[PDB]
From a paper:
The Linker of Nucleoskeleton and Cytoskeleton (LINC) complex crosses both inner and outer nuclear membranes of the nuclear envelope to mechanically transduce cytoskeletal forces to nuclear contents. It is formed of nuclear SUN (Sad1 and UNC84 homology) and cytoplasmic KASH (Klarsicht, ANC-1, and Syne homology) proteins, which interact within the nuclear lumen. JAW1/LRMP (lymphoid restricted membrane protein) is an atypical KASH protein that is localised in the endoplasmic reticulum and outer nuclear membrane, and is specifically expressed in certain cells of the immune system, small intestine, pancreas and taste buds. Here, we report the crystal structure of the SUN-KASH complex between SUN1 and the non-canonical KASH domain of JAW1/LRMP (herein referred to as KASH6).
Thus, we crystallised the SUN1-KASH6 complex and solved its X-ray crystal structures from several crystals at resolutions between 1.7 and 2.3 Å. In contrast with previous SUN-KASH 6:6 structures, the SUN1-KASH6 crystal structure contains nine SUN domains, such that head-to-head interfaces of three SUN1 trimers interact together around a three-fold symmetry axis in a ‘trimer-of-trimers’ configuration. KASH6 peptides are clearly bound at both of these KASH-binding pockets of each SUN1 trimer (these are herein referred to as KASH6α and KASH6β). The third KASH-binding pocket of each SUN1 trimer is located on the underside of the trimer-of-trimers structure, away from inter-trimer interfaces. In other crystal structures, at resolutions of 2.0 Å and 2.3 Å, we observed no third peptide, with the KASH-binding pocket containing only water molecules. In absence of KASH6γ, the remaining structure was essentially unaltered (r.m.s. deviation = 0.1 Å). Hence, the third binding pocket on the lower surface of the trimer-of-trimers structure cannot stably bind to a KASH6 peptide. We conclude that the SUN1-KASH6 structure is a 9:6 complex in which three SUN1 trimers are bound to six KASH6 peptides. Further, their distinct conformations mean that all KASH6α and KASH6β peptides of the structure are oriented with their N-termini directed towards the top surface of the molecule. This asymmetry within the SUN1-KASH6 trimer-of-trimers structure positions all six stably bound KASH6 peptides in a manner that is suitable for the insertion of their immediately upstream transmembrane helices into the outer nuclear membrane.
Author numbering:
A (entry chain C), B (entry chain B), C (entry chain A), D (entry chain B), E (entry chain C), F (entry chain A), ...: 618 to 811
J (entry chain D), L (entry chain D), N (entry chain D): 530 to 555
K (entry chain E), M (entry chain E), O (entry chain E): 543 to 555
Amino acid sequence: TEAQARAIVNSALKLYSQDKTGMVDFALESGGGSILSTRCSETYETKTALMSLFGIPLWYFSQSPRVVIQPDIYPGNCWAFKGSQGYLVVRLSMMIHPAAFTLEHIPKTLSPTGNISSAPKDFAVYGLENEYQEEGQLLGQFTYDQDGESLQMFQALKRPDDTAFQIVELRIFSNWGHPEYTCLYRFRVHGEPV
Amino acid sequence: TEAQARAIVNSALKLYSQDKTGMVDFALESGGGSILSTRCSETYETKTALMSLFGIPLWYFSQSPRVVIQPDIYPGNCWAFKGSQGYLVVRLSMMIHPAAFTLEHIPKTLSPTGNISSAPKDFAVYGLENEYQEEGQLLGQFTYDQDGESLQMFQALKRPDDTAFQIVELRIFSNWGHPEYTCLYRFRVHGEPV
Amino acid sequence: TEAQARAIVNSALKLYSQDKTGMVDFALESGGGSILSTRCSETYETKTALMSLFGIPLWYFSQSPRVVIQPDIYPGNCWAFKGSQGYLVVRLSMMIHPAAFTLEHIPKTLSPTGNISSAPKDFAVYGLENEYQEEGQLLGQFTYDQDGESLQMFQALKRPDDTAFQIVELRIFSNWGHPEYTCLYRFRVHGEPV
Amino acid sequence: TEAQARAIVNSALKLYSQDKTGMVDFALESGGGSILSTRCSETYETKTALMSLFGIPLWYFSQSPRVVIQPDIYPGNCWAFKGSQGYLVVRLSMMIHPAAFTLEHIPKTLSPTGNISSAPKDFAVYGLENEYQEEGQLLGQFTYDQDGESLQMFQALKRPDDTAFQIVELRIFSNWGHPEYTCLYRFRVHGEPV
Amino acid sequence: TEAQARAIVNSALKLYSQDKTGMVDFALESGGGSILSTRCSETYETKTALMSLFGIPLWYFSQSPRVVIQPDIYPGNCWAFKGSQGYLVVRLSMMIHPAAFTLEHIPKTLSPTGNISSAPKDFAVYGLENEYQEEGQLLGQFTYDQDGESLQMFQALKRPDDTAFQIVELRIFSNWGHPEYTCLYRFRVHGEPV
Amino acid sequence: TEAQARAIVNSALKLYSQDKTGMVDFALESGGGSILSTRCSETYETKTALMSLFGIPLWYFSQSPRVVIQPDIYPGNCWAFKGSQGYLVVRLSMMIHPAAFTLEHIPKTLSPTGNISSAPKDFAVYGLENEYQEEGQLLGQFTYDQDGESLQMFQALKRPDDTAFQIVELRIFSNWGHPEYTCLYRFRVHGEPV
Amino acid sequence: TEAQARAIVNSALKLYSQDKTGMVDFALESGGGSILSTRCSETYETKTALMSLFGIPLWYFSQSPRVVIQPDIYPGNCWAFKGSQGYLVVRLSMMIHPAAFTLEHIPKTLSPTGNISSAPKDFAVYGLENEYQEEGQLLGQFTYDQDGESLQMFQALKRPDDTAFQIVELRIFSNWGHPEYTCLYRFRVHGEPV
Amino acid sequence: TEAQARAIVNSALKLYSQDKTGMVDFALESGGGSILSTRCSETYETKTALMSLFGIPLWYFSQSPRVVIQPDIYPGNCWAFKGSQGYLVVRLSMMIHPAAFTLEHIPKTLSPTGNISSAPKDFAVYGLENEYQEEGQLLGQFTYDQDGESLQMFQALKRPDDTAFQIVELRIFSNWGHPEYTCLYRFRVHGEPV
Amino acid sequence: TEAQARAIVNSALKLYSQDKTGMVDFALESGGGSILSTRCSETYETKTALMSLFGIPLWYFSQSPRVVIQPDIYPGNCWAFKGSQGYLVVRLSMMIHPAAFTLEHIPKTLSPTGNISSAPKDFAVYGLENEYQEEGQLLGQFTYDQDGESLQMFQALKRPDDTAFQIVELRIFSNWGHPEYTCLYRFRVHGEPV
Amino acid sequence: QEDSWTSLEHILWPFTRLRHNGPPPV
Amino acid sequence: PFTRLRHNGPPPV
Amino acid sequence: QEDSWTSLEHILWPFTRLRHNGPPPV
Amino acid sequence: PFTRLRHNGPPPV
Amino acid sequence: QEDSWTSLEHILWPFTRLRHNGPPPV
Amino acid sequence: PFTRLRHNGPPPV
Ligand SMILES: [Cl-]
Ligand SMILES: [Cl-]
Ligand SMILES: [Cl-]
Ligand SMILES: [K+]
Ligand SMILES: [K+]
Ligand SMILES: [K+]
Ligand SMILES: [K+]
Ligand SMILES: [K+]
Ligand SMILES: [K+]
Ligand SMILES: [K+]
Ligand SMILES: [K+]
Ligand SMILES: [K+]
């Protein structure tokens, strides 16, 4: 079983190094995703990020929704929107048939407070045919589970036909109890290009 | 033993992905820690400057002390202070009873010079009730081991009572032999919040 | 076979955490490598990544050759040069006898496009004695294999003497078929200091 | 009829001098209206930039959306957005029940190109209770008539109850044929304050 | 009466285009008038004017007394001084015998509040022989009438002799009821040069 | 004759509101005209309009030739060039067959000085094929009539062919007698696009 | 008499070291006084400027009025205003009943020009209840004596009641003959705090 | 006694001009002293110092501990530390055997309040062998006397042996009653170099 | 002898307060003197006075030749030029017949080093007719006496004519033995204006 | 170049004070 | 350095 | 020169919005 | 660009 | 040129910290 | 003017 052990280890590490999933993330900004920042809910003013130049601290700012489609997930590298409800619209790097979505949040073991009450809880994902469309196609209704793993995957509803989308809306309806804000670390969109 | 092998590997990867420790780092900057830069040793002065203005060379430094509470530890992303003695003052993201500390340095195998003589060697950690407090309370005396692992953890002194701290001072008394400077890659503070 | 399994897993994770190779990268920017940008091929200019501020179009973004000596390899974090052959000149952090080189590209499974036709294919590495020397000493001819692993290592030619270099030129002679550009994610230089 | 002629002329001039309408414009910037620029469509990107810095061209735009709530309507003092669909969000100087809206465009006789194909054509006005409200309340659907007068007024929908608004969204669904952009000279909001 | 009608219309428009009065305004800044800003009462800090550059909003400021001698009279383009009493000293573009003064305020039909309670009510105008003179010659006592036309003209007292003035003081003793401030849109000085 | 009167008044007001002429001004800056300031005469420099900040003398103000292609014609908002003859080069927003030109000056009734001796008197307009051509094609010789209307229009010469121009040079050969300077309030270029 | 001689000398030196007077200067800037620069005369405009920007000369001044409430009186460290009349408004470090004032000028023996014709001659001091108060209360009329000592003290008017002031206006009505400007080295305000 | 009188006067003036003491001040910054600003107590935020450039006032700041080793002692030119206890560490320009220390404060006759309640009262001075030493050698315990002369001298304890110091710590234990802060004008260190 | 004593003391204090000499210094910067820094010797560059900001090394401080014509003579406030002989060119505030010169240095009793070996010793003063003349007219040869008074005065040569100068060059031919540098605290130029 | 100056002048305009020491050109 | 640009192409109208 | 540009880009990065109008190079 | 100026004429005193 | 540097140095002076690593010239 | 500098010497590691 030794050579098999090495194979299992290498397979696990290889999957881990491929963005932990081995799947294209069509929302990822560096690969061509974009936030439609005119169609996001209000940013909560945490002002907990320090900006310096040449080692000189200059001022404190709050994270933009762009961080939702960037990979760093150390505690605090999340977009905080006001209250427990919000929405985010992302333009994808390709026209795809969506198959699944991923939401990540930090594990409780890394949160200073002991809890992740600011994490999203109930949410839904919609497909939009153009960036001005108000009523999208429901791609799924989901709950991010505060007792589950840090990274959670959610399966899209597949319609009997195949409509492709290049715009996706995430609606968060509730969080795990934080009254002031909800913090979104990363949202990924997976699927098959047309 | 195959399923057991998968379980061991997943456990190892899960821990690895949780900042290598599975423990809150209350010093982590993005999570709410901050360097109190007016109380830290002076940053090491490089031979040349980063720019000039009106003919005067400006900025004779490599990295600010902020990098000590940021997770990247590629060679060079460390804070260098002058000589082999120095100190760093950190405000934690919460008021905690400190339980343990972590110091990371690069492995010898990644050092361009072949050695890590610039790594801290003997050090101590103190809790401060105010950042201008002259004498702190000793939380521990330790040695970073150049023949040990890159990441090393150190147990705080066991206290009869429990005084909480939100400010800690790291004092380095020695390095592993570099005459010019000492380079700190990362310092973490672990414990239980009040 | 359980303790042996834990040893194998810890060994694999340890290697992974050491820049995946356990070897000094003398080209790495944070450790002192730098691009000689006046001796690189023309950067590919799209007007398609628009940065705006308060809705005002501000500037069109494109990656500089510096990213080739930085570790992030999420899709898109590469230097795109114009056409299907080009060159990059790198100044190493130390004078070394070069022994091996590494090239990384994203895996196909993460590419939004479905392919990695923009990856380098045929390439050579030359050592330069000064920044004005045009051809230099051939250190090796190689092919990056698009059907191979994301990270690939190549051994420098064994030559009767050992000449040291602090400047190496990477010449890409072809890519894997993309008509517009070639994308370099990371190039490393390994060897022995003088 | 001579004194009557003088009376008619003075009446016409008096109305002309009162911002051509004799009605409060609650969107007028100098009187307390403001563009909520993070909720407006992205400003149209001109081919060339306004300056360069360190070799990078900067500012690819003509006018900011502020000009839409400023009175000058000489050709070119309009806000251009990309394509033929877009939106503008305006905070009014007071909480009002909206009664009517005004759109101005230049006359065909003053257009350098000979046409006003860039004028808005079909549009709608919504009242928002908060600027991050996703779906507004429809106040009306209208068409700006390129064969009509430069200044056109539109009657808000007659509501059973009276909900007041201090934020309005103007959505343009079409223009008069220009493929590249749509240019908005001035939008006014009239009504009764609460 | 048709040709006569056209003549009446043209005469009215011509007068309108000549600053609505057909008379030199010797206080007008562009023509050579100046505020003696060290001899004005306190500006009220409204901070309702936005300042931007390159479309980027930067900060809010309050209008200076210079606007009292500039022609734009859209709502808000006025100088607000603190309380209901104040004074303004203006140096004229010529040494003149003053004949009349004009005060303009916006019409009630253009005010968001429905009223012009911030308009000046009781005021007087004095002639000063030099800019250090404390006690001037009374040129008239007047009331701006909130029920009258937007632009109102006031006849100077003509002294039996003829003293010329190049400095004028406007004293406002009261306003139409606004407790916080008084807003002055435009003040003109008319007369005959020496 | 009442409805006819209202029609006449509305017709006159409509014409007035269309830049007083109802004709495109291809020199207008906001619509795309620009001054070639290196091909204009020397600006007249008084040290008499002092701008100060917090009482500190800061810089001496004078109008640039750009105001000649801007609409404001309040006294003083003109370009003053040195002496009594000079020239201005204007790049039009389109390539046109020029048909007519307009010159505006303030009326004598608004001039603080009592006269308009600084107005242009004898002038000519030339079409230039490129910005380096010195004389160009004569488009017409004219006189601005100081006893005439504020706005005066002049018809270009009728020539057997129709050559198009996007650069026109206005040469002022004399003024109405002012010894120090000549003041240009506004110059317009009318014609047919290609 | 030897010990008496030492006592006299020590007394003289002690007084000299106590700002030459032994009295609080409530106008002294470092101790809490401030110039109200928007109420002071305009600073004298020098022939040449201190720098240029984009070809425009900027800053035509020598010293700001702040130097009047700073102790250095080497030649040139004085505030120059235009002509022979002017005023300076100062907010004191406390609310006081003013008892005396000091004016210093350089001695004739230190003047490069051989004379001190730029020194203030006739002046008055007023107490202001608010800095925008138009007419102050006279605290005294005085003459600075060019044949007297460098430092001169002046007794405030003896008041029946006691009104306190924290703002004082110094008005200079004349100088000692310099036509271009008047230079103020230092003005002090003495009295008893409330 | 006349020649003797002149000699006494000249001797007194000469001593006065030699920093009032005739003794080297080894803490003086310009001569080579330095504050170890990481080992000073908290600065009180007075924000009573104005910063301007080119006569333009910019912002208010608080004095740093550097002023304790600079010579100007006009009221307000002192370092205010928070509360009535604090400490300051200064590195001297030479290795010396300390003999005496001087503390200066302004005289009551120059303080606006009539008192010097912010002056240090009880203090002690310690010698440090290196800048990281926590427990120094006591050089003396002293009280600054609010009823004494402005400049006061204090004799060091001389140890039976001779240890030299190049680092000195001033500990202030109390002040003369000001609750918010203590203000330190100047501290000097005198002695004999090794 | 008491009144005579007071007269002597007041006379001495008065002279002391007049820049210690009672004579115009035509080189004094505040009164209009300036250094021609391109005609001064090389400044001595130590890298030992480090200015830092927030602990970041920023720039290395050294005094410019301007301090030679500024009055502060605390130790260290001098211009240090490289080596033991050098030169400084000064433009005077007026065209004068030079009569005398003054040199100041710190007294030995205030020097941290115990000596003033860095003081100028042998020197000469030349008058230059224009800033490009190299040698000039010798105005005198002198020695600064290290055993003499801090301030020393030297009489210019008596020459049959009187040539006026506005530029003087001070040539230091030797110092009092310091091997690295020579330190000039203050140089004054006295004489008669033209 | 002077485009920079005029945009700087726009920034400065409302905050400066303007004094005429003689008649401006009209 | 700061460096303005000419446009050479007409603005939106 | 472009070291200045990249440090300016670091300053600007978090505050700008990024829109892709076409696929970026990958 | 930023560019200081020499004065060549004496300041007020 | 260095007039600009000295006025910048005036701006910077009160906010920087000065450490002597060796005796300055006196 | 603003003017960056090359280092030519390796950083602390
Ligand atoms: Cl870029
Ligand atoms: Cl100007
Ligand atoms: Cl320096
Ligand atoms: K993220
Ligand atoms: K780190
Ligand atoms: K990379
Ligand atoms: K508009
Ligand atoms: K106005
Ligand atoms: K104009
Ligand atoms: K002064
Ligand atoms: K001090
Ligand atoms: K000096």
